[PDB]
Design a protein around this ligand. Structure first.
Ligand SMILES: *[C@@H]1O[C@H](CO[C@@H]2O[C@@H](C)[C@@H](O)[C@@H](O)[C@@H]2O)[C@@H](O[C@@H]2O[C@H](CO)[C@@H](O[C@@H]3O[C@H](CO)[C@@H](O)[C@H](O)[C@@H]3O)[C@H](O)[C@H]2NC(C)=O)[C@H](O)[C@H]1NC(C)=O
Ligand SMILES: *[C@@H]1O[C@H](CO)[C@@H](O[C@@H]2O[C@H](CO)[C@@H](O)[C@H](O)[C@H]2NC(C)=O)[C@H](O)[C@H]1NC(C)=O
Ligand SMILES: CCC(CC)O[C@@H]1C=C(C(=O)O)C[C@H](N)[C@H]1NC(C)=O
Ligand SMILES: CCC(CC)O[C@@H]1C=C(C(=O)O)C[C@H](N)[C@H]1NC(C)=O
Ligand SMILES: CCC(CC)O[C@@H]1C=C(C(=O)O)C[C@H](N)[C@H]1NC(C)=O
Ligand SMILES: CCC(CC)O[C@@H]1C=C(C(=O)O)C[C@H](N)[C@H]1NC(C)=O
Ligand SMILES: *[C@@H]1O[C@H](CO)[C@@H](O)[C@H](O)[C@H]1NC(C)=O
Ligand SMILES: *[C@@H]1O[C@H](CO)[C@@H](O)[C@H](O)[C@H]1NC(C)=O
Ligand SMILES: *[C@@H]1O[C@H](CO)[C@@H](O)[C@H](O)[C@H]1NC(C)=O
Ligand SMILES: *[C@@H]1O[C@H](CO)[C@@H](O)[C@H](O)[C@H]1NC(C)=O
Ligand SMILES: *[C@@H]1O[C@H](CO)[C@@H](O)[C@H](O)[C@H]1NC(C)=O
Ligand SMILES: *[C@@H]1O[C@H](CO)[C@@H](O)[C@H](O)[C@H]1NC(C)=O
Ligand SMILES: *[C@@H]1O[C@H](CO)[C@@H](O)[C@H](O)[C@H]1NC(C)=O
Ligand SMILES: *[C@@H]1O[C@H](CO)[C@@H](O)[C@H](O)[C@H]1NC(C)=O
Ligand SMILES: [Ca+2]
Ligand SMILES: [Ca+2]
Ligand SMILES: [Ca+2]
Ligand SMILES: [Ca+2]
Ligand SMILES: [Ca+2]
Ligand SMILES: [Ca+2]
Ligand SMILES: [Ca+2]
Ligand SMILES: [Ca+2]
Lengths: 387, 387, 387, 387
């Protein structure tokens, strides 16, 4: 057992190969599958796992009612092997949680589970399933974290948490965690910026996060930092806007794009010098479709020109949250950190006539060999028996 | 593989961080979940498991009828990983049992399962799943034990069993067990005391148990002993009465408090010199709510003053049994024995209009970092389809 | 990994401690549990397992219809951990089989599964799941074997199979198997005797089997042999008759007792010099009740006097097959081979108004510490939804 | 952990002993069993697994509707232990796929999953569950592969893929794969031949495949090749025609037999010098029955004389696909590669009046000990509740 190094670069990729699809909603029409949202994938040096927030209820049972609601004492962070449906019979218990993160440092799993009331929530940190630290809300307004993997470099793992308003300026903290103990945190000086639900990855010993501006930005904010939590900030400049909702593509900005800026969706992007791989919905107004776009000057340039598009989910199909995950050299035998991504395919409320809301998932890994666009959608036929 | 030392002291703690929640009754509305009661948690040097007594039946199935009944030949002691629902598809069989204890000595699991008739019950002891001893009823009146983990120090494990009436003086025995063999037993000289369902923990090579007085005490009796089973006895002095039912808080006693003293509920407390952490129900009269209370002179002092109260379950929510469990240094890497506790959230009879009685659970570990009070209730909507 | 020695004596025992109960039928009212019959228990140097013949169907589903039928192409030998319900989600596949045996030599599992037509069935032998030998019917009349564990001594495993009429003289062969290969077999000279469904155990390097005389004996036949398959034969002499059906207890015989001799039930007994532990039904005419009797001169003496009786299942409750299993010193750390037993608790046809027949199980291990008689019955309320 | 040598010859065999049967459709009537088709078996040096293509849906649930359809975005390659039903609670996820292959090289599993559109499908190759390559459609017309195990020799694994029309000349490529990376590929010069759904096995360091001619052959084509992918081609000469449909047996041909030659079924055969073991349907016109036939000159001779026939599934029972699988010496301890085979038992559309199509399986291993013919059919009673 050895710490992941996290010191190689991101592998450059030409397209995305499908890695997993779980068909959870399809299978939960009959089988015992958790009602879930906020899924994400994270890997150890030996296997990849799907992490997700349960509702403490199964699909197609009465306790699925009301599950549009984000935060309750019943929600738990749990994990199963990638591509398997999340069921009480295959799922490992991680933490009591209505907001979460997790990541493996090479030696053990770190899990971060936020529960408690909206005015003073507490994140419980676990290393190898043992409680190792806690951190309490510091603005008393829904302490919340990534809903995707935290990032590890040389035995330290890093995450971002936000506390405060979700329709205005909030507070954003970056954390360095070692064996599940917070060893350093910094509060970001970021006036007129808004960060939430960061998708963070390691690249050459430093962390880059792409996040959700729920306040006033239809492009995505980014923060990058070193092991000492010295950070830089910015927004993705590309006029290929990454949030949902958003405007039609036009000239972008290196600040927040106010047009259609309020509200948002968790997502991700990968930086490659001045270029960017952008994952986004296909709809500008709802969580429908998904596509990957390579924009070779999109990190720093404001034009709406891009070089490559790869379809993932079709425009008339439900999508949802998306996030980054990596596969480190210790897992693959490669010489670079491999970028991958997952998409949550949300079914039910508020868009469909059900009592419940739940998602399934798809994921892909970046390759340089041949790939193809298609649509891999959820596939479930709603409503269900219980509706 | 090495014996747990058990020679460090209990970690002083300032608050309780939430560790697990299984949502078993919400899930068993559709999934295949055992009807259970009397769960408890116990840990090895590698993992924590939930142990429970099934009723040989699944929730929402006709065999769950009459599960108010305590003792039958169908009841079995099983276990699963902490925070998962108890299902036949994830559950390890331990013993045939309608009363039980279990604990791991660092090398293997000890399990204690009592079955057979009320007038001649037999505890079957197993080590690593092999039967290694038996002990038979010596008062022919419901031989019964902790319904929580036994306690181990340096290769020896310890438990308490009771035999006799449950509305008067009974007989209380203390056992030393090594590799599943009873190596010593003593009968307590405790006239006017009553002890059952003891919650016992190791602390500086010695055992402390905090039990239930079902005869005439609304404070909790305690017994502590060394490896030779030389023991001392008393009741918790605090005016913050620990049993349910009980009177409102007032001046306490260092012997049994007869007011509201008949009947009771399994519980626990942790001793820290002259102070005490008390877990108890929030209602004085029924199994509702739960809270933890730090009384810095409550072990030996009789006033009803205390310094910390942390909410766990809201007063209008169903409560039940509670018990201690520890995490040893061999598991955590800490220099002290970490105290944790679980709470059984009972649903169904006699308080609700169902044909069945079954419980879910929640657990908490002691920490010194920030924590928050809240309510983490069972969450199921009764009645169920079978009712 | 080392061969079981099989050279110590059977442990002398004063009574029987309950080891397992699975509540299969109760649990299969809702959950996914196999329809099964002919269960049995067998242990490796590390765990004990329940082996059973499925009907290729689950309880409370329509394909359970007609499962009174013994032999079909759908029946499979499968195994799960002891005390767990046999479910498609916890059961390991062993062999296609409508008659079976299994046993662990200390290194790997041997399994023996008979399938094919009644006029030319074939036993498929597997060692660690790999086909290692076959043997075909030699009388073309339902080749059949123990329906309980084979017995191992110093790397060789032994079993008995029968072929021919079930209401008359048939043929009986004994086999020595090494790494799943038959290395020697002999056909017994046993005129006027009948052997099937043998319960065989090792004791001081030799094998003793107690079997079912379906032709004309209400006491049990026995055959014992050394590693060379040199054998001795006889019937249990005790007037405490062991089969079902049988007469009421009277003077026994060392030959087959013809009174109520026809038909039978698989059973077991353990020899201790001139004495015998007899397991049997409590009813003389149907498979109801179960009891363990120590008769100190019952192996060779014909009187109906015994010294000890221990109730297991009460007279008005369904029972069924029973068999021996052992726990070798390599598993327990004892200096003797420990005797144990299981009882199948048959539910459904032909005695009850259902479409199906299935069993659950209980088992016990022999001890010298205190024990108690009771009744641990199946517990299921028939008929079921499907009926 | 060591690479499978693959340098020994195939074990000559005299008959087929039954190895597994899952009863999946019978079990799926109540249990949580995937709708599947195109199952196959493949073994490592430690265990044998069944691989299968799910339809992303369970039996007896509405999502099973329309599962006659071959290719969708929901279909996934998963695996479970041989003889267990494929359930989401015992199934390992492998790949997103509507056509697949898998094999173990002695160190890790290679999996090949083709998904995406008919005009541009991509095979995703994984080694130990990590994506290691991709190959994309080169004729834009349903890239498709074996639906059975690939074959490995000394650390290289080999498969066959087809792209083009399924009613005319297509293009056929052979691949060498090492640690999941394509290291060589060749396109076959095979005018007037057609190959798909190849059953390929190793034998004396070389690969033999027997395939399906869907264009104009009612005998089966074959291709054999060495590690450098230098190949030879031919059709099986026997007048015992192996495809389905086919004409009645008569004088065969060493090229494609046009009579009844369009259409087909996946199958297999084993070469032993100039002789062949042929598995085929018993019906000449639909997928009914199964039998094995040893024709000692059938590889190269055109007569319809043969010497052994062993019944496997009766002529009035549904059969389907069949394929080879091997057990290497590293798994068995033998001095030769053991031949085995599986048969897919298809139920539902198009032959039965259901909304769904799904398969169970049986499997057999070659032996030289005694064996028997019989029928081991699927056994389910259609229609189901969902129909
Ligand atoms: C899905 O859930 C909604 C919301 O219900 C609320 O949350 C649930 C999980 C439960 O804890 C409910 O107890 C809780 O009400 C269900 O709508 C609700 O239905 C109930 C009874 O069917 C309504 O009860 C009424 O309440 C009013 C007071 O406002 C009384 O005057 C009435 O006499 C009656 O008691 C309840 O009002 C209603 N809640 C809302 C917000 O409309 C809904 O039925 C459920 N759907 C299914 C399929 O279960
Ligand atoms: C199987 O699928 C068919 C085709 O989609 C279903 O039939 C359709 O049902 C929808 C829902 O009401 C109707 O709007 C269409 O008129 C139907 N089309 C046809 C051709 O019938 C059918 O209900 C499905 N069966 C199940 C069990 O889901
Ligand atoms: C707390 C504010 C935040 C942004 C609006 O709400 C999130 C939005 C969500 C959404 O936009 O789908 C779902 C998240 N589960 C929720 N997070 C929490 C912690 O409740
Ligand atoms: C036997 C007396 C005892 C105290 C009154 O009953 C206990 C009370 C219980 C209770 O108060 O909820 C549940 C326990 N399962 C039961 N124990 C047994 C062995 O049945
Ligand atoms: C084959 C004769 C034998 C004795 C009558 O039948 C057995 C009796 C049985 C019984 O008495 O319950 C059930 C067994 N499963 C059956 N064995 C076989 C192989 O079918
Ligand atoms: C694509 C042509 C091919 C031959 C007609 O179809 C196959 C026939 C099938 C069949 O004859 O049963 C089922 C296979 N799953 C299908 N393969 C794919 C990739 O769809
Ligand atoms: C990265 O870290 C590894 C492990 O410490 C080290 O061997 C190597 O020299 C470092 N950097 C690169 C880019 O290879
Ligand atoms: C990684 O951390 C270890 C332990 O703190 C330290 O010795 C080492 O210098 C670190 N490596 C780098 C490249 O910072
Ligand atoms: C605890 O016991 C261990 C036994 O290995 C011993 O080494 C040590 O002296 C003791 N520790 C404390 C904290 O007293
Ligand atoms: C249900 O339980 C009651 C006792 O509460 C019992 O006496 C009654 O007979 C039971 N009903 C069934 C159907 O088992
Ligand atoms: C613990 O037990 C061992 C073996 O019985 C003994 O040698 C040792 O002295 C004990 N340690 C203490 C601290 O009592
Ligand atoms: C059971 O099988 C019998 C015999 O085939 C049949 O006649 C009967 O209707 C079936 N019953 C049920 C409930 O399926
Ligand atoms: C055990 O078996 C081996 C043969 O494998 C033999 O050499 C050895 O002597 C045997 N022991 C006895 C006591 O028979
Ligand atoms: C097997 O492959 C290894 C590594 O390529 C090589 O050393 C060896 O010569 C090969 N064996 C044969 C028989 O070709
Ligand atoms: Ca926004
Ligand atoms: Ca651009
Ligand atoms: Ca009391
Ligand atoms: Ca006080
Ligand atoms: Ca008889
Ligand atoms: Ca006698
Ligand atoms: Ca053809
Ligand atoms: Ca021929």
């Amino acid at each position: 057992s050895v710490k992941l190094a996290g010191n190689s670069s991101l592998c450059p990729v030409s397209g995305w190969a499908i890695y997993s699809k779980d068909n959870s909603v399809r299978i939960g029409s009959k089988g015992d599958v958790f009602v879930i949202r906020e899924p994400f994938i994270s890997c150890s040096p030996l296997e990849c796992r799907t992490f997700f927030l349960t509702q403490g209820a199964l699909l197609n049972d009465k306790h699925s009612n009301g599950t549009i609601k984000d935060r309750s004492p019943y929600r738990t962070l749990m994990s199963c092997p990638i591509g398997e449906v999340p069921s009480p019979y295959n799922s490992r218990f991680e933490s009591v949680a209505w907001s979460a993160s997790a990541c493996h440092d090479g030696i053990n799993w770190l899990t971060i589970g936020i529960s408690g009331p909206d005015n003073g929530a507490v994140a419980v940190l676990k290393y190898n399933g043992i409680i190792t630290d806690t951190i309490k809300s510091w603005r008393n307004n829904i302490l919340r974290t990534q809903e995707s993997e935290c990032a590890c470099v040389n035995g330290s793992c890093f995450t971002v948490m936000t506390d405060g308003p979700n329709n205005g300026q909030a507070s954003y903290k970056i954390f360095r965690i070692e064996k599940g103990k917070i060893v350093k945190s910094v509060e970001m000086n970021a006036p007129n910026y808004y960060y939430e639900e960061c998708s963070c990855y390691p690249d050459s010993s430093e962390i880059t996060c792409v996040c959700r501006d729920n306040w006033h930005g239809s492009n995505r904010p980014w923060v990058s930092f070193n092991q000492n939590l010295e950070y830089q900030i910015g927004y993705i400049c590309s006029g290929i806007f990454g949030d949902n909702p958003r405007p039609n593509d036009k000239t972008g900005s290196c600040g927040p794009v106010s047009s259609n800026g309020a509200n948002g969706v968790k997502g991700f992007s990968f930086k490659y010098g001045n270029g960017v791989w952008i994952g986004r919905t296909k709809s500008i107004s709802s969580r429908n479709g998904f596509e990957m776009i390579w924009d070779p000057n999109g990190w720093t340039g404001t034009d709406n020109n891009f070089s490559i598009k790869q379809d993932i989910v079709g425009i008339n199909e439900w999508s949802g949250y998306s996030g980054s995950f990596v596969q480190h050299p210790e897992l693959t035998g490669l010489d670079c950190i491999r970028p991958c991504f997952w998409v949550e395919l949300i079914r039910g409320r508020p868009k469909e006539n059900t009592i419940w809301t739940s998602g399934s998932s798809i994921s892909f890994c970046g390759v340089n060999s041949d790939t193809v666009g298609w649509s891999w959608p959820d596939g479930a036929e709603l409503p269900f028996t219980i509706d």
